Design an enzyme around this catalytic site. Structure first.
Site, PDB file in Angstrom:
ATOM      1  N   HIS A  94       1.372   4.030   1.712  1.00  0.00           N
ATOM      2  CA  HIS A  94       1.716   4.683   2.891  1.00  0.00           C
ATOM      3  C   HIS A  94       3.314   5.155   2.810  1.00  0.00           C
ATOM      4  CE1 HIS A  94      -2.028   3.870   5.731  1.00  0.00           C
ATOM      5  NE2 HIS A  94      -1.979   4.958   5.088  1.00  0.00           N
ATOM      6  N   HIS A 148       5.427  -4.721   7.483  1.00  0.00           N
ATOM      7  CA  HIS A 148       6.071  -4.698   8.799  1.00  0.00           C
ATOM      8  C   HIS A 148       6.441  -6.228   9.518  1.00  0.00           C
ATOM      9  CE1 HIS A 148       5.205  -0.720   9.602  1.00  0.00           C
ATOM     10  NE2 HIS A 148       4.034  -0.796   9.012  1.00  0.00           N
ATOM     11  N   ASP A 150       5.556   4.812   4.882  1.00  0.00           N
ATOM     12  CA  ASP A 150       6.452   3.870   5.445  1.00  0.00           C
ATOM     13  C   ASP A 150       6.711   2.580   4.423  1.00  0.00           C
ATOM     14  OD1 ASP A 150       3.884   3.068   6.128  1.00  0.00           O
ATOM     15  OD2 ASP A 150       4.591   2.122   7.641  1.00  0.00           O
ATOM     16  N   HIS A 151       6.050   2.579   3.370  1.00  0.00           N
ATOM     17  CA  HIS A 151       6.326   1.377   2.329  1.00  0.00           C
ATOM     18  C   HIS A 151       6.588   2.110   0.983  1.00  0.00           C
ATOM     19  CE1 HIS A 151       4.880  -0.667   5.651  1.00  0.00           C
ATOM     20  NE2 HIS A 151       3.629  -0.215   5.820  1.00  0.00           N
ATOM     21  N   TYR A 182      -7.857   4.205  13.441  1.00  0.00           N
ATOM     22  CA  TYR A 182      -8.751   4.506  12.657  1.00  0.00           C
ATOM     23  C   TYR A 182     -10.139   4.471  13.251  1.00  0.00           C
ATOM     24  CZ  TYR A 182      -6.074   2.944   8.831  1.00  0.00           C
ATOM     25  OH  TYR A 182      -4.882   2.736   7.715  1.00  0.00           O
ATOM     26  N   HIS A 220      -6.992  -1.380   5.147  1.00  0.00           N
ATOM     27  CA  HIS A 220      -5.835  -0.761   5.606  1.00  0.00           C
ATOM     28  C   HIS A 220      -5.668   0.653   4.835  1.00  0.00           C
ATOM     29  CE1 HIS A 220      -2.405   0.411   7.885  1.00  0.00           C
ATOM     30  NE2 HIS A 220      -1.717   0.780   6.865  1.00  0.00           N
ATOM     31  N   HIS A 263       0.758  -1.271  -0.041  1.00  0.00           N
ATOM     32  CA  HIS A 263      -0.112   0.008   0.200  1.00  0.00           C
ATOM     33  C   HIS A 263       0.874   1.135  -0.147  1.00  0.00           C
ATOM     34  CE1 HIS A 263       0.704  -0.632   4.309  1.00  0.00           C
ATOM     35  NE2 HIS A 263       0.459   0.674   4.245  1.00  0.00           N
TER      36      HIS A 263
HETATM   37  O1  LIG Z   1       1.411   1.715   7.848  1.00  0.00           O
HETATM   38  C1  LIG Z   1       0.810   2.175   8.741  1.00  0.00           C
HETATM   39  O2  LIG Z   1      -0.445   2.660   8.667  1.00  0.00           O
HETATM   40  C2  LIG Z   1       1.479   2.255  10.153  1.00  0.00           C
HETATM   41  C3  LIG Z   1       2.707   3.184  10.294  1.00  0.00           C
HETATM   42  C4  LIG Z   1       3.388   4.283   9.780  1.00  0.00           C
HETATM   43  C5  LIG Z   1       4.502   4.853  10.267  1.00  0.00           C
HETATM   44  C6  LIG Z   1       5.150   6.078   9.799  1.00  0.00           C
HETATM   45  C7  LIG Z   1       4.522   6.472   8.771  1.00  0.00           C
HETATM   46  C8  LIG Z   1       3.495   6.037   8.166  1.00  0.00           C
HETATM   47  C9  LIG Z   1       2.929   4.749   8.788  1.00  0.00           C
HETATM   48  N1  LIG Z   1       3.305   2.584  11.515  1.00  0.00           N
HETATM   49  N2  LIG Z   1       2.393   1.515  11.934  1.00  0.00           N
HETATM   50  C10 LIG Z   1       2.710   0.756  12.993  1.00  0.00           C
HETATM   51  C11 LIG Z   1       3.451  -0.562  12.578  1.00  0.00           C
HETATM   52  C12 LIG Z   1       3.733  -1.392  13.759  1.00  0.00           C
HETATM   53  C13 LIG Z   1       3.736  -1.009  15.097  1.00  0.00           C
HETATM   54  C14 LIG Z   1       3.383   0.185  15.463  1.00  0.00           C
HETATM   55  C15 LIG Z   1       2.985   1.245  14.481  1.00  0.00           C
HETATM   56  C16 LIG Z   1       1.442   0.956  10.975  1.00  0.00           C
HETATM   57  C17 LIG Z   1       0.439  -0.115  11.190  1.00  0.00           C
HETATM   58  O3  LIG Z   1       0.171  -0.514  10.097  1.00  0.00           O
HETATM   59  O4  LIG Z   1       0.117  -0.442  12.115  1.00  0.00           O
HETATM   60 ZN   LIG Z   2      -0.101   1.849   6.282  1.00  0.00          ZN
HETATM   61 ZN   LIG Z   3       3.159   0.516   7.488  1.00  0.00          ZN
END
Ligand SMILES: O=C(O)c1c(-c2ccccc2)nn(-c2ccccc2)c1C(=O)O
Ligand SMILES: [Zn+2]
Ligand SMILES: [Zn+2]
Length: 266
Positions: free
Chosen positions: A85, A224, A87-88, A190, A159, A83
Site C-alpha cells: 500500500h 502503524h 502508506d508503506h 472492506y 489486509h 504490504h
Molecule cells: O494501509 C491501510 O490500508 C491504511 C491506511 C492508508 C492511508 C493512506 C494511504 C493508504 C492506506 N490508513 N489506515 C489507517 C490506519 C490507522 C488509523 C486509521 C487509518 C490503514 C489501516 O490499515 O487501517
Molecule cells: Zn494497507
Molecule cells: Zn497502512
C-alpha cells in the site's frame, strides 16, 4: 452545468509525516521513519536492509537517517515490505533509483507494487503511488540472510493478498531478541462477506490471526505503530506498552468479528 470532480490526493494526520531521529530497537535494528509510520533499518557488517519506507514523500528523510547511522546509498542492499500500500511502499521506486537496493517480495506483493497500488481489491484507483519492480520472488517460509541476520517470511494474507510478517533474531545485552514485524490485520472499509474480488477473504484472515499468534515474538512491531501500542515520540519509554503478538492477534480478531456483525446489520 457541472464538470467531473478534480483528482483528490489522499491526506494523512500530520504525525504520519513528522520526521524523527533514529530510534534504536535492538543492537542492529533502528526505527528511521516518521512518528507514526514504521520504517526499519537493519545494519550489518555486510550491508543494510530496509523494512518498509512509509509514504511517497518520505524518501529523502529515510536517506538522511541512513546517513546519520553511517549507511551510504551503496550500502543499502535490500528492501522488504509488509504490504504494498501507498502508506508503506510509497517511496520504494525512488529509493531504488537513488541507492543500490534490490526489492524482495512474494508474487502477490510484486504484482500490486508493479501496478503502483492501482486496481486495489478494496480501494480501487484511490490510493496510487509510483510503480516499482521486484528483483527476487519469495515463497512462504523462505529465508533471506544479510550479514548473518536471517529474515524469515510468514505469509499472513487478508489486509492484502500479499501481506507478510518478517521475523529475525537480533541481540540486546548479549541476549537474543526475537523481533516480529507483523503486517496489518485491519480491514478499513472492506466488504468482508461474499466479496467477488476476494471470495475466501474471511478464511484467510482467520488463518492469519493464528499465524500471527504463533510467531517467535520477544518484541512485536507493526507498520502503524499504534496497532502494537508503540509510541515512537516517547523516547526511552517508545516500546514499553507494546503488545505481545498473541494480544495483537486477539485484539484484531475481536475487531474483525465486530466489523462482520456491523456488515450483516448494514
Ligand atoms: O494501509 C491501510 O490500508 C491504511 C491506511 C492508508 C492511508 C493512506 C494511504 C493508504 C492506506 N490508513 N489506515 C489507517 C490506519 C490507522 C488509523 C486509521 C487509518 C490503514 C489501516 O490499515 O487501517
Ligand atoms: Zn494497507
Ligand atoms: Zn497502512
Amino acid at each position: 452545468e457541472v464538470p467531473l470532480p478534480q483528482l483528490r490526493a489522499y491526506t494523512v494526520d500530520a504525525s504520519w509525516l513528522q520526521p524523527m531521529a533514529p530510534l534504536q530497537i535492538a543492537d542492529h535494528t533502528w526505527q528511521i521513519g516518521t512518528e507514526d509510520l514504521t520504517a526499519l533499518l537493519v545494519q550489518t557488517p555486510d550491508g543494510a536492509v530496509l523494512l518498509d519506507g512509509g509514504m511517497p514523500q518520505m524518501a529523502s528523510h529515510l536517506l538522511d537517517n541512513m546517513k546519520a547511522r553511517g549507511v551510504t546509498p551503496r550500502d543499502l542492499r535490500l528492501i522488504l515490505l509488509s504490504h504494498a500500500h501507498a502508506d508503506h511502499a510509497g517511496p520504494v521506486a525512488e529509493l531504488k533509483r537513488r541507492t543500490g537496493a534490490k526489492v524482495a517480495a512474494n508474487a502477490e506483493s510484486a504484482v500490486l507494487l508493479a501496478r503502483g497500488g492501482s486496481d486495489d481489491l478494496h480501494f480501487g484507483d484511490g490510493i496510487t503511488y509510483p510503480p516499482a519492480n521486484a528483483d527476487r520472488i519469495v515463497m512462504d517460509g523462505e529465508v533471506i540472510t544479510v550479514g548473518g541476520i536471517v529474515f524469515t517470511a510468514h505469509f499472513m494474507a487478508g489486509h492484502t493478498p500479499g501481506s507478510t510478517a518478517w521475523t529475525w533474531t537480533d541481540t540486546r545485552n548479549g541476549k537474543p531478541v526475537r523481533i516480529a514485524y507483523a503486517d496489518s490485520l485491519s480491514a478499513p472499509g472492506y466488504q468482508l462477506q461474499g466479496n467477488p474480488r476476494y471470495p475466501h477473504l474471511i478464511e484467510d484472515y482467520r488463518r492469519s490471526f493464528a499465524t500471527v499468534r504463533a510467531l517467535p515474538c520477544d518484541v512485536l512491531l507493526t507498520p502503524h505503530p499504534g496497532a502494537s501500542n508503540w509510541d515512537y515520540a516517547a523516547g526511552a519509554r517508545a516500546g514499553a506498552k507494546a503488545l505481545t503478538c498473541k494480544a495483537y492477534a486477539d485484539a484484531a480478531e475481536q475487531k474483525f468479528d465486530g466489523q462482520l456483525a456491523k456488515e450483516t446489520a448494514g
